[PDB]
Structures are given as structure tokens and as C-alpha cells.
Symmetry: C2
Subunit: 272 residues, 2 copies
């Protein structure tokens, strides 16, 4: 039976989706589209076999997951779709209520790690659906991209790029999500899992070469113009090698104790 594969519904993985379709890979999957928060839980509980897993959640289940090498959702400097929209300087929030978009699990944690370490602030947090209107807030995905390219500039609100703040603070890149197979599925289905892995790399590679076509196509249906989408797609960094694995190890060391996993948690990788 086709492996049950998750896919983030956001624009950040649209180029990858274009790749999955263009190569014919989609016909080898039983695909589920949803937000990262949900896809993560579904994989953990066994409702999915392979899929994207927000980093924080992946580390909490590191013993039961095996990450795919060479593909992830990250950055090296700005990410553009993982931000903090605020109406006051980040230093002035030690007692201010900050809303955390419920679709996020890694970006919200990182946002906290920065507000308290770089701006020395202990905010009064609360989680809610992403909306930037109803709700100084941490947004990811399309909501964050809209807040960065449209809402922020329209209503003169400040939009801080989380990938940028991390880079400035550590000089390191960042990984928000990785692809993983449940350990039981990888062992039960060694061949399929490897084939899925290779199909994702192949699809990702093609999305890199046809980035302009994806931007043009999506422009037809998104609020973002072609140039913005093209810029966005090229800004995202889907690599997952040693340099990226270094950003993870570091992040895991800084948040591991107060998040649910050893500061030195082991990241098992799918072996060739």
C-alpha cells in the first residue's frame, strides 16, 4: 500500500509540491495536506508513515523517528515566513501579552528563546489561531509572509524576521522542520522509505531549477506578486547536511532542558 505522506499546506512547501507533481511522485503517495502542528502529531501517533515534522516535536520523539538527510525547511539569515509582528520595541514586553500562532511549535519556542535572551523579557504568553488582526505575536507560514510583505507595511507595524534574529545572535543558520519516517515504518518498509526519500530529493531539486515557473503559477492565485513569491522561494533553504545539523544541535542544547528532550538529544538519520 502507498505510504501515507504528510505535506505542509503553506507556500513554503508549494515549490516542493510542484516538484512532487512534475516528477509523478504524487501517484506513489497517499498524501495528506495540513498545517505543520497537525502533520507532526499525526506522524507521531501513527496516522502518517512519512512526513514533515516541526523540529521541536521531532526532538521530543527522536527515539521513535528517523530524519531524511539532505532535505529540510530552514534558512541562513532571513526566512521571511517566521516572524514577530509588534507595535512596541521587543525590549518593552516583559509583562506584555504575546500571542503565539497555534500552527507553530518550533518558531514559537525560538521566538521565546530570543525575546528572553536578546531582549531580556519574560512575556505573558498565550496561544491562539493565527490571524494578525484578532491576533505582539509570532506567526509562521502564509500568515507570517502576509504580515511581512503586506499587513506590516500597510499599517506601519514592525515585522522582525526570526531567521534573521537568530543569525544575528549566533551567526548560525536555522532548521524549522525536517522530514521523517516513523521508526517502525522505516524498519518495516526499508525499500519504500528509501524510495520516498530519494523521490523527495528529486522533487526538491526540480523545484530549485523551476522556481520561476512555480512563482508565476502561484502568483495567479496568491495575494503575493510573482517577484515576491520568486524571492521567497529562493530565500528558503531546504538543505540538510552538516552545516544545518549544526544549527539543530545548538538549538537543542539551548532549549532541550526546558522543552522535553536532552540538551544532547540524538538525531537519527535514515541510512543508505
Amino acid at each position: 500500500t502507498r505510504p501515507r505522506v504528510g505535506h505542509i499546506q503553506f507556500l513554503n512547501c508549494l515549490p516542493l509540491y510542484w516538484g512532487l507533481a512534475r516528477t509523478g511522485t504524487l501517484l506513489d503517495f497517499e498524501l495528506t495536506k495540513d498545517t505543520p502542528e497537525k502533520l507532526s502529531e499525526q506522524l507521531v501517533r501513527g496516522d502518517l508513515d512519512i512526513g514533515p515534522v516541526t523540529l521541536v516535536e521531532f526532538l521530543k520523539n527522536a527515539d521513535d523517528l528517523v530524519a531524511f538527510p539532505d532535505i529540510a525547511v530552514g534558512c541562513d539569515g532571513p526566512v521571511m515566513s517566521c516572524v514577530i509582528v509588534s507595535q512596541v520595541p521587543l525590549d518593552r514586553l516583559d509583562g506584555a501579552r504575546v500571542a503565539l500562532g497555534s500552527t507553530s511549535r518550533t518558531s514559537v519556542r525560538l521566538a521565546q528563546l530570543l525575546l528572553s535572551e536578546r531582549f531580556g523579557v519574560q512575556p505573558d504568553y498565550y496561544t491562539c489561531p493565527p490571524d494578525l488582526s484578532l491576533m505582539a505575536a509570532v506567526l509562521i507560514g502564509d500568515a507570517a509572509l502576509r504580515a511581512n510583505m503586506i499587513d506590516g507595511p500597510r499599517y506601519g507595524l514592525d515585522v522582525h524576521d526570526l531567521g534573521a534574529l537568530w543569525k544575528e545572535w549566533t551567526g548560525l543558520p536555522f532548521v524549522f522542520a525536517v522530514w521523517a519516517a516513523r521508526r517502525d515504518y522505516a524498519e518495516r518498509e526499508p525499500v519504500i522509505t528509501r524510495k520516498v526519500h530519494e523521490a523527495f530529493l528529486a522533487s526538491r531539486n526540480l523545484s530549485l531549477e523551476e522556481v520561476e515557473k512555480v512563482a508565476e503559477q502561484a502568483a495567479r492565485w496568491e495575494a503575493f506578486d510573482e517577484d515576491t513569491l520568486a524571492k521567497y522561494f529562493t530565500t528558503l533553504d531546504f538543505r540538510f547536511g552538516a552545516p544545518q545539523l549544526e544549527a539543530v544541535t545548538e538549538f537543542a542544547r539551548r532549549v532541550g532542558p526546558t522543552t522535553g528532550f536532552p540538551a544532547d538529544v540524538k538525531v537519527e538519520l535514515l541510512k543508505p
Copy 2:
């Protein structure tokens, strides 16, 4: 904003799906997969903008649907996936069977889920087919045939959807061998069976096909709820 497009979940449209993917067409649709019966009901009531419509339902609603020329789900001899081993997923084949088996019974409808009760279509029919007869071959051993057509609910989007469907169907014809190899990995049919099946299906919709529709219509129209001379309004 994206047009809501229906797609028959059966293997008969897997090659077409391969094509919708290969060309990237899928990213321009908000696609819904289901059985022909439901996809037809969905379009007629407005839950879909464009999609496949089993012939009988298209004709019954011919004044409110514009068909796409040059593509449909037909045959010119056996179809393999429409047999007589009434399945509830069918609206056209079942009617064709009532025509054959009467001019060449005590009918009752139920779920095309075998192991019970028979007229079948889709995957269930091709799985039962491999006694078993062939509706496409019997109609061919009597008088081609068009089981379903693509149609939009009666502007520019509609036009490009049509073209994208055409481009996607054309690519699937030249890559049918690929669709078969991949499909054999998960279906119950071996590669050659599927390759034979995909190549057996006839997806054209021009003169030789529109001809077979007027003849099916004239033979059943009166006893099937639509004018014996209903007009099929092709997209301009």
C-alpha cells in the same frame, strides 16, 4: 479563486491524473476525487465548477452543462471496466446494460461492493473481470461508446482548465507505459494488464464519439428522462 475540479477516483482516470501532475496542472485546481455518481451530483448542485459527468446525468442536465470537446471517457470495442458479472456508482453503464439485456429483468440497485448480489464499473468491475461480459464489447457486437464527458457548470479560467485537461490527456497517452509501471506497484493488476487497460480506453471526443452519443441517447432518452434529441452544447 481556484476552480473546483472533480476527478473520478477509478483507475480509468489514473493516466489522466498522472498527466495533471506531470504538467503541474494540479497546482491550478482545487481537486476533489470521488466516484462518478457523486462527482456528477456535486457539479449539478454547484459544489464543483468543472468535472467529469457520467453521460446519462449530463444529458438529463444538458441545458445547464457545457461539455469539453476532444476528451471524455469512452471506448471502441471492449472497455474492460464496465461489465455484467446494479452498482450504485453508475448512471450510464447500468442503463446500457438495461438496453442490452432486454433487446439482445427484475432490477434493484445497491453498493457496487461485490461479495453480495450484476452490473459493475470502475475498479470493482476490472477486478471482477479478472462469467463476465463486456458492455463495451456487447454494444460493439450490436450496433463506439462515451461513458462520461467533462463539463463546466453553465470564463477564461474555464477555457484554460479545458486546455490543461487536453495537454494532460495528451501527455498521458505517450507516457502510458510509465503510468502502468508505477501503478502496478500498488494495484492488484500486473503491469501488462494495466498497460493493456489504459491503452484500451478511448479518450477522444470528436465526430466518431459524438456520433455514438446521439445513438445511445435516441435509444434510451424517452425511457431515461431526457429528449431523444437533446443537444450537447460543446464549449466554444
